[PDB]
């Protein structure tokens, strides 16, 4: 008695292996019931597939008898508790009603075993959770739903045509003693043609002449309108939903464009902000990080922010001798932005409110005017500590000591002043190391 868990991968493999016969039953039981040639021409194939479906249904009952459920956070493994919690509910009632045992020419007595629609929908929900292309999976799922609806209405039209009589009037399927319409391929593809032209509300089919045919075509048109237009609109919404993010970014661009065309901004600066939008779209840096993780807990958000920036944080002299909780809270507080080439990150004398850490950039410390590079700063270094942390032995306080220009497309980690002072409360050692680093670089520059 080994208890499987519903958050594993073997339970998902079982959900695939049991959503195969449920989809086989829901696709082909009404077809074998409504087309009389599929039941009698193929006879060993549906016997083999029905034996496989009944064996997999009995094994589905024996798996759901031993499927654990979370009580007070942890999984349970008491087999009698799992069997009693299973035996309580309507899913066990639907499984036993789907597995009653109920010559060999009627699958209409086998209509009780399409009652595992909950298991098929559980497979589709677990695949939509597990997959990497969820919007394409949702499009495939709703296309499967409208194909199931078109196939079921095709079989229902052929059953109503069989009940009224083949070829007695104009609306029904024609006379099946004729060798043209007598074939199973012609039967099924013409029933799919009538089903598509009824449910898509095209209606180029022959009109009804009898009252039961009028009632079925009215009910079929209304079912097609409501259910088919709802799922076709959901297909259109889910195709436009992946274009909506790029359309949001483009609508932001067009708002800034109509601002600059209203206010008559000059052409080289307009070209430079167009190049910034082209860089920001061609390097795929559009999704905001702490906004897209705005609901995660701080432990998983810190694990994500460490496993993104790991090659950057392994080079920093702060994060080689500091503490792990300080590292976690600082990478929770690091908000990155991207600078242009040839721009001042910091002026000569300014109010310093943040600290910058380099992350895949290349910037240099220029003089008071013009581009005369003193020291180039590659990735992994940092600057801003003199204007953030107040040096007691300085010639100036809360004023910056240098001019820094960015040579290329740099990406810096903005770490604000109050965030650093609330991060450096119980971690004095790294604060003292930054203090002596700022003191020695200020004793270099007086």
């Amino acid at each position: 008695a080994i208890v499987v868990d519903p958050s594993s991968n073997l339970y998902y493999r079982w959900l695939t292996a049991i959503a195969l016969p449920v989809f086989y039953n829901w696709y082909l039981l009404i077809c074998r019931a409504c087309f009389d040639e599929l039941q009698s021409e193929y006879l060993m194939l549906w016997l083999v597939l029905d034996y496989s479906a009944d064996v997999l249904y009995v094994l589905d009952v024996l798996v759901r008898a031993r499927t654990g459920f979370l009580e007070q956070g942890l999984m349970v493994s008491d087999t009698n508790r799992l069997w009693q919690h299973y035996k309580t509910t309507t899913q066990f009632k639907l499984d036993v009603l789907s597995l009653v045992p109920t010559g060999t020419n009627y699958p209409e007595v086998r209509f009780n075993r399409l009652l595992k629609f909950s298991r098929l929908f559980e497979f589709f929900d677990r695949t939509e959770t597990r997959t990497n292309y969820p919007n394409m999976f949702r499009i495939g799922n709703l296309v499967l739903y409208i194909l199931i609806i078109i196939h079921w209405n095709a079989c229902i039209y052929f059953a109503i045509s069989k009940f009224i009589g083949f070829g007695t009037d104009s609306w029904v399927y024609p006379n099946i003693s004729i060798p043209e319409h007598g074939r199973l391929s012609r039967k099924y593809i013409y029933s799919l043609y009538w089903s598509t032209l009824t449910l898509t509300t095209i209606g180029e089919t022959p009109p009804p002449v009898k009252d039961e045919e009028y009632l079925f075509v009215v009910v079929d048109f209304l079912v097609g309108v409501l259910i088919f237009a709802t799922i076709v609109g959901n297909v259109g919404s889910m195709i436009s939903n992946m274009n909506a993010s790029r359309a949001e970014f483009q609508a932001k661009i067009d708002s800034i464009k109509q601002y600059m065309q209203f206010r008559k901004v000059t052409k080289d600066l307009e070209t430079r902000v167009i190049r910034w939008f082209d860089y920001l779209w061609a390097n795929k840096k559009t999704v905001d990080e702490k906004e897209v993780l705005k609901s995660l807990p701080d432990k998983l958000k810190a694990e994500i922010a460490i496993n993104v920036h790991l090659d950057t944080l392994k080079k920093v002299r702060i994060f080689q001798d500091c503490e792990a909780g300080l590292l976690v809270e600082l990478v929770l507080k690091l908000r990155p932005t991207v600078f242009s080439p040839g721009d001042y990150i910091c002026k000569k004398g300014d109010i310093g409110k943040e600290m910058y850490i380099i992350n895949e950039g290349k910037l240099a410390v220029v003089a008071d005017d013009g581009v005369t590079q003193f020291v180039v700063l590659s990735d992994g270094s940092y600057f801003g500590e003199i204007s953030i942390l107040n040096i007691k032995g300085s010639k100036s306080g809360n004023r910056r000591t240098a001019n820094i220009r960015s040579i290329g497309y740099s990406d810096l980690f903005c770490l604000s002043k109050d965030d650093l002072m609330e991060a450096l409360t119980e971690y004095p050692e790294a604060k003292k190391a930054l203090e002596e680093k700022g003191r020695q670089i200020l004793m270099k520059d007086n």
Binding site: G73, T201, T230
Partner: protein, 441 residues
């Protein structure tokens, strides 16, 4: 039958308003059918008349015996007394619509013949129909099922009206006169409802209009069919979108997180941990951010829900047994709930301490033995751990032992500067917390 009905909490008033809806919809569905189809004949006119008398006395008895019992809120206070309720009803506009609905043309049938075009004033209890719709959507928990039933009923009612107006056009041109009109073969309602479906759905495929009245009819009916089909499929859609907008917002945030963590190439263990968090958050909360719903409400509403759930949880625990009630209630407003996966640490032996966890629906395991694998105690739900970090400046004893989440723990966090700004307003509660610290050490 009480002296004053409370309209929001009365199941008998809901059943009676259903009985008024089953008279108003009888009027709106069987006034054009009797008006234009040959169904009100000499045989069953007493059947139609006793149904008319039943619906009319339901209207009159509804007004004169249920409507001045309606309680209402005047000036904030609930009005109960029957003379004030009758005055408020009789100087309203619902009484104006009902008294314009109950003007009898029963004097006029016996003079000018039996004709249900005289009953075109009984379709004015639409305010009672909409009151029934609003009350059933307030009573029902899953109101989108009644909203899709109501949108389907609106579509079937507009198709019923279009079937009656098409039978008017075919009886006006003569049945079987032109090729456009109803021929007269089968069921007179079904073969006109088929034309109403194929016209107002805009399918087409009907016989073409021949003369000018039929061209005007077919033009206006396809135009109104385009607009009614677009508007009602937009209503049915909006309803089916706002039904699962919560799950769609959750799945949009989950796909956005998964797409970001796939574009930045985070490993599969971290992706499995984030997917496990999203699965358990939708499994246990059915909602992404609880503070998103508990930030759009006012302070008294948020405090009432907080005192219900979290004062049950904290009246269970014994560490807060003598503290002050407004300090506890501001803590209940200030309590932040995070979720921990099975296995991760919530305190490590060596890190600093700034959180006080109140475990609710979880199971954590402290670990402070010889090598960190012996469980000293396994704290169940409704306990408190993380209270050592009050005194010794947070660094005399930073964190005592390891403590992991054995199951899916859902802890109630409390930031330390928020705890201190709460506690500076209560020095007696600070003395009780220092007494707890002295009995701790």
């Amino acid at each position: 039958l009480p002296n004053s009905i409370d309209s929001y909490t009365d199941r008998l008033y809901l059943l009676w308003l259903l009985l008024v809806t089953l008279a108003y919809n009888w009027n709106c569905c069987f006034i054009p059918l009797r008006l234009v189809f040959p169904y009100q004949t000499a045989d069953n006119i007493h059947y139609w008349l006793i149904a008319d008398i039943i619906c009319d006395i339901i209207y009159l008895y509804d007004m004169l015996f249920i409507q001045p019992r309606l309680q209402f809120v005047r000036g904030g206070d609930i009005i109960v007394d029957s003379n004030e309720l009758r005055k408020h009803y009789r100087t309203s506009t619902k009484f104006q619509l009902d008294v314009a609905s109950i003007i009898p043309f029963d004097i006029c049938y016996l003079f000018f013949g039996f004709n249900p075009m005289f009953r075109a004033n009984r379709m004015l209890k639409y305010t009672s129909f909409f009151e029934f719709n609003h009350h059933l959507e307030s009573i029902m928990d899953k109101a989108y099922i009644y909203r899709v039933i109501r949108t389907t009923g609106y579509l079937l009612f507009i198709l019923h009206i279009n079937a009656c107006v098409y039978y008017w056009a075919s009886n006006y041109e003569g049945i079987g006169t032109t090729r456009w009109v109803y021929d007269g073969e089968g069921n007179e309602y079904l073969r006109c409802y088929y034309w109403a479906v194929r016209t107002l759905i805009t399918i087409g495929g009907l016989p073409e209009p021949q003369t000018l009245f039929e061209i005007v009819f077919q033009l206006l009916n396809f135009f109104s069919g385009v607009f009614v089909f677009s508007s009602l499929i937009g209503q049915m859609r909006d309803v089916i979108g706002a039904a699962t907008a919560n799950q769609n917002y959750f799945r949009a945030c989950m796909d956005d997180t998964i797409a970001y963590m796939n574009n930045y190439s985070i490993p599969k263990l971290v992706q499995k941990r984030v997917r496990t968090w999203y699965e358990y958050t939708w499994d246990s909360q059915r909602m992404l951010d609880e503070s998103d719903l508990l930030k759009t409400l006012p302070t008294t509403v948020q405090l009432a829900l907080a005192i219900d759930v979290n004062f049950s949880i904290i009246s269970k625990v014994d560490l807060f047994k003598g503290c002050d009630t407004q300090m506890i209630y501001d803590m209940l407003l200030r309590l932040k709930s995070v979720l921990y996966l099975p296995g991760d640490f919530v305190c490590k032996k060596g890190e600093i301490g700034k959180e006080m966890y109140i475990i609710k629906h979880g199971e954590v395991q402290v670990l402070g033995g010889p090598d960190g694998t012996k469980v000293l105690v396994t704290l169940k739900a409704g306990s408190v751990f993380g209270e050592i970090s009050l005194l010794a400046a947070g660094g005399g004893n930073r964190r005592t032992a390891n403590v992991v989440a054995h199951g899916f723990a859902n802890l109630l966090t409390l930031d330390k500067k928020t705890l201190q700004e709460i506690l500076v307003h209560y020095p007696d509660s600070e003395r009780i917390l220092m007494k707890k610290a002295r009995v701790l050490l």
